[PDB]
Design a protein around this ligand. Sequence first.
Ligand SMILES: CC(C)CCC[C@@H](C)[C@H]1CC[C@H]2[C@@H]3CC=C4C[C@@H](O)CC[C@]4(C)[C@H]3CC[C@]12C
Ligand SMILES: CC(C)CCC[C@@H](C)[C@H]1CC[C@H]2[C@@H]3CC=C4C[C@@H](O)CC[C@]4(C)[C@H]3CC[C@]12C
Ligand SMILES: CC(C)CCC[C@@H](C)[C@H]1CC[C@H]2[C@@H]3CC=C4C[C@@H](O)CC[C@]4(C)[C@H]3CC[C@]12C
Ligand SMILES: CC(C)CCC[C@@H](C)[C@H]1CC[C@H]2[C@@H]3CC=C4C[C@@H](O)CC[C@]4(C)[C@H]3CC[C@]12C
Ligand SMILES: CC(C)CCC[C@@H](C)[C@H]1CC[C@H]2[C@@H]3CC=C4C[C@@H](O)CC[C@]4(C)[C@H]3CC[C@]12C
Ligand SMILES: CC(C)CCC[C@@H](C)[C@H]1CC[C@H]2[C@@H]3CC=C4C[C@@H](O)CC[C@]4(C)[C@H]3CC[C@]12C
Ligand SMILES: *C/C=C(C)/C=C/C=C(C)/C=C/C1=C(C)CCCC1(C)C
Ligand SMILES: *C/C=C(C)/C=C/C=C(C)/C=C/C1=C(C)CCCC1(C)C
Ligand SMILES: *C/C=C(C)/C=C/C=C(C)/C=C/C1=C(C)CCCC1(C)C
Ligand SMILES: CCCCCCCCCCCCCCCC(=O)O
Ligand SMILES: CCCCCCCCCCCCCCCC(=O)O
Ligand SMILES: CCCCCCCCCCCCCCCC(=O)O
Ligand SMILES: CCCCCCCCCCCCCCCC(=O)O
Ligand SMILES: CCCCCCCCCCCCCCCC(=O)O
Ligand SMILES: CCCCCCCCCCCCCCCC(=O)O
Lengths: 270, 270, 270
Amino acid sequence: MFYVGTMDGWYLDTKLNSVAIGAHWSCFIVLTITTFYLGYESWTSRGPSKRTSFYAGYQEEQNLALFVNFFAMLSYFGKIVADTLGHNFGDVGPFIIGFGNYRYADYMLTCPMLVYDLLYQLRAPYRVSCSAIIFAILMSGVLAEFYAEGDPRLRNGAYAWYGFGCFWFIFAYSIVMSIVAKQYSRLAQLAQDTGAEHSLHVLKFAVFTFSMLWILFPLVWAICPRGFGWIDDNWTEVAHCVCDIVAKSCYGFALARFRKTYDEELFRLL
Amino acid sequence: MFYVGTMDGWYLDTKLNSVAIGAHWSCFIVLTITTFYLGYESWTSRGPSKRTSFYAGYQEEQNLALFVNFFAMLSYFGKIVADTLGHNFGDVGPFIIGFGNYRYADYMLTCPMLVYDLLYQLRAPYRVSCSAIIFAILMSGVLAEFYAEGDPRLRNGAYAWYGFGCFWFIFAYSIVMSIVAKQYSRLAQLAQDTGAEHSLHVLKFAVFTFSMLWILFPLVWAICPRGFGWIDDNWTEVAHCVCDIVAKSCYGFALARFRKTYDEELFRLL
Amino acid sequence: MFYVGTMDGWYLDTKLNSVAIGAHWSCFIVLTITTFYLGYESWTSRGPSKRTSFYAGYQEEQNLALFVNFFAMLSYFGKIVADTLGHNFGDVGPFIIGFGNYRYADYMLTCPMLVYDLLYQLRAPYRVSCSAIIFAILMSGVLAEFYAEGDPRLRNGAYAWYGFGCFWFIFAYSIVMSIVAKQYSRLAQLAQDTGAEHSLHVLKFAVFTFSMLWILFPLVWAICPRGFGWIDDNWTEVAHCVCDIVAKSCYGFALARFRKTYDEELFRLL
Ligand SMILES: CC(C)CCC[C@@H](C)[C@H]1CC[C@H]2[C@@H]3CC=C4C[C@@H](O)CC[C@]4(C)[C@H]3CC[C@]12C
Ligand SMILES: CC(C)CCC[C@@H](C)[C@H]1CC[C@H]2[C@@H]3CC=C4C[C@@H](O)CC[C@]4(C)[C@H]3CC[C@]12C
Ligand SMILES: CC(C)CCC[C@@H](C)[C@H]1CC[C@H]2[C@@H]3CC=C4C[C@@H](O)CC[C@]4(C)[C@H]3CC[C@]12C
Ligand SMILES: CC(C)CCC[C@@H](C)[C@H]1CC[C@H]2[C@@H]3CC=C4C[C@@H](O)CC[C@]4(C)[C@H]3CC[C@]12C
Ligand SMILES: CC(C)CCC[C@@H](C)[C@H]1CC[C@H]2[C@@H]3CC=C4C[C@@H](O)CC[C@]4(C)[C@H]3CC[C@]12C
Ligand SMILES: CC(C)CCC[C@@H](C)[C@H]1CC[C@H]2[C@@H]3CC=C4C[C@@H](O)CC[C@]4(C)[C@H]3CC[C@]12C
Ligand SMILES: *C/C=C(C)/C=C/C=C(C)/C=C/C1=C(C)CCCC1(C)C
Ligand SMILES: *C/C=C(C)/C=C/C=C(C)/C=C/C1=C(C)CCCC1(C)C
Ligand SMILES: *C/C=C(C)/C=C/C=C(C)/C=C/C1=C(C)CCCC1(C)C
Ligand SMILES: CCCCCCCCCCCCCCCC(=O)O
Ligand SMILES: CCCCCCCCCCCCCCCC(=O)O
Ligand SMILES: CCCCCCCCCCCCCCCC(=O)O
Ligand SMILES: CCCCCCCCCCCCCCCC(=O)O
Ligand SMILES: CCCCCCCCCCCCCCCC(=O)O
Ligand SMILES: CCCCCCCCCCCCCCCC(=O)O
């Protein structure tokens, strides 16, 4: 009778329309392109010096954007296999971290890597600590799905867990931004008028812009059928596809361009 | 008919009484307090020198006690949401590492971090190796729950897995204590009568005391309905709450006090 | 009606014969022996210098073969407990990473460690990156099991996921071998005729031989009931036991012998 968390739910027909299926295809294609591009950048990178063969091979923190895009691509491969077979893939079948049959179970793998990577660009403190908190926020979102989709007697568990996640998200942000802020401040005074100043401006704004676009995820939760229900389940899939293209692919391309142009300029100051 | 491992089990009414629910509330409050306290110590720590701003931010091994308390707090948040909704949370619903709807599934995340942290205080060898073995012991305990709570035809699987876990636990201990012993021995001769001797005495006894209190977990298993059944399921929840307050919170406060008083005294010798 | 992914499947009688049960016993005994042997080598190792007490304790990358054998031993302990109780253990019960009730769910823990260890022997670049890709390939194999064993309407999902895994496996190999190749090339010119040359020859061939034996896993998939069905489920269990003895135990013994004889000879060049 309740399908969430079961194999019975997995064998049902897909509830998704052409709009949601099209969004999954679009997201998979963009993530696959980004993965091959970031793979090429990883192979050919010689570092800021431009004299170290397989630089990204020895400094493997450089491959974090590649692995974010690669794991997101694997998750969307699963969504398009399920869509083309025409079976239900929403919060049914086996619970596997890094796989997106459970909403936010894919992000539990990729988001901690993405926050680590963002903070690593500014050599910011609390990188592992912010990855751990993001892991717990995404766990909160997974548990809110089980309550939201289960027996309506337990529905208020979804708000308890959303609230917990939002609490720690606001906390994490209000500490993260106060690190990104101090890291730019340190380097800004250090940079003086050297020309590294302009690249350092760009790095702070890019890292801040991509950080702040993460607020779209709890906002989509609030407007979708989990909260107010102003958008349906099909448009929620479209909202997540767009947010994933921005958070992972556009981030991946933006960072890859920064490393192409401004890496050495800041490698002396960072 | 058998509920362990199923969503059907999750929708049943809670089997817990007021004593077990009160123990969960008490444990959640203490873990939340410890988390905020250890968060404050992490933010304000300047290291043993007292001259490094955001020391714990760059030396993130210092945040391990914080993350143990934070993940235990998340697990107990889940128990009190389930208690207040009034649904069954004992070995039912989705299997998620770091979440305590399966007994020992929460500990699979926090215990390896806690053993790493203990051995890191003495700069002991085999820190990752001891974290790996503790992970396997807690896996053993998870698998013993599935056999203990399932079809009684398979009940003897619970003893096979408890035995496996106990075997490797005795092994791990009988090697760990022989490291803690040699690490104190090395530093004891090195310390001479310098005043660092007294702090080093305290560190060995504290690390040994907290290590030895981990024997309470397999002893609670033996006395609870899994073994002899001298205590019921409600008193087992109380026993785990008390053991968690000692193993995580009291450990967290004890370590934080050691770092406040004796960090620099031993940072020259460690 | 479909048992894959369910607790109902776990309570069924074993489908395995004496040949498959004997293979599980044989594999468990060999992995346990290898674990105790590699444990002894870890304890007594003094490094290439032969002057560092608990060398493997401080350089914990040396314990990777030990932890591969230890986790494989835990997985086979589970198979023999299930065989002796006489219950079904094939892709039923709880999904737990590092546990082999789901085919390839045990390997998701051990294979990334094993590829890290192989590449670490040659100080090869892309070690974490190759561990991440192997993790995704083994995830692909897990998802192909759910489709292969479920509702036959969704059977073609098994080929989609096998294809995805094979694609990234060929990719990973065709990049890995081009690293092992360049790492041997670098050291070969560096070694000249010093006597380190002969040991370096042995290391390249051993690492290449063990790397290439990993092709047996997707080949067994193709010949077993997942693909052409030339062998039955019982002989598939035997094929995996033999492949595990070679990939983990024989690897473990071969590496341990290399470190006994040729460690110092190459520690100056590596
Ligand atoms: C989406 C499916 C069909 C996979 C196709 C991936 C395509 C788009 C990938 C694979 C190889 C890639 C190319 C690899 C190398 C280079 C050289 C350099 O100048 C950067 C871009 C460029 C030219 C890449 C563009 C994207 C690319 C063409
Ligand atoms: C990047 C673009 C160009 C290529 C698309 C790649 C993937 C997503 C495509 C290519 C071929 C596809 C498969 C083609 C055939 C079948 C059989 C059908 O009964 C179920 C769907 C299934 C199993 C498809 C799933 C999706 C699939 C694996
Ligand atoms: C349990 C629920 C209600 C959450 C409440 C957490 C409370 C207990 C936390 C939040 C902020 C914390 C304080 C933060 C900072 C300091 C300064 C220093 O002198 C150590 C203790 C002290 C004074 C902390 C004591 C505990 C504290 C008051
Ligand atoms: C630390 C102390 C002071 C604060 C306690 C925090 C948490 C555990 C409390 C505060 C408010 C609580 C919620 C209040 C309202 C409801 C609706 C009810 O139908 C189910 C329980 C549920 C969902 C509660 C779960 C537990 C809860 C989230
Ligand atoms: C498979 C079950 C019964 C467990 C038994 C494990 C046995 C085979 C293990 C445990 C202790 C091990 C021994 C430990 C130490 C040494 C000394 C050295 O010269 C290497 C081999 C040798 C002699 C080992 C051989 C294997 C050994 C005997
Ligand atoms: C290495 C060799 C020498 C020792 C073998 C170790 C393990 C695999 C053996 C030793 C004793 C065995 C147990 C003996 C008794 C029972 C009770 C029976 O109703 C179910 C099987 C079960 C639970 C067995 C499972 C496997 C077991 C745990
Ligand atoms: C690649 C995907 C990214 C970067 C996703 C990030 C998602 C979040 C920050 C989600 C956060 C949420 C909360 C703050 C509350 C609980 C619900 C979530 C999971 C949507
Ligand atoms: C914060 C919680 C802690 C430190 C818990 C530690 C738990 C253990 C060491 C449990 C060990 C067990 C065995 C030795 C055998 C199997 C049963 C267990 C899991 C209770
Ligand atoms: C100890 C076990 C080892 C080293 C196992 C390795 C297994 C693989 C490389 C398996 C690979 C597969 C694919 C290439 C495609 C999908 C099916 C798999 C999982 C068999
Ligand atoms: C340390 C944790 C801090 C507290 C964070 C969680 C607090 C928010 C709980 C929200 C519960 C909302 C329940 C709504 C009930 C209703 O619909 O009437
Ligand atoms: C932390 C980022 C910002 C998140 C903004 C949260 C705004 C509150 C959303 C609550 C939605 C759940 C309650 C809706 C219930 C209903 O009216 O049906
Ligand atoms: C390397 C592994 C070492 C062995 C560790 C496990 C051995 C203990 C097995 C205990 C089985 C107890 C079964 C009791 C059967 C009964 O009740 O009659
Ligand atoms: C390794 C730490 C010490 C653990 C102490 C173990 C003591 C044996 C407990 C076995 C309990 C299981 C058998 C009870 C069966 C019964 O009598 O009903
Ligand atoms: C980036 C991903 C690359 C593509 C890798 C997967 C492509 C192989 C898909 C195989 C599908 C085979 C379906 C067979 C259908 C049938 O039986 O008729
Ligand atoms: C990447 C390593 C090599 C793998 C070799 C793959 C060979 C193709 C195997 C496809 C098997 C699945 C299709 C069989 C369908 C059938 O005929 O019943």
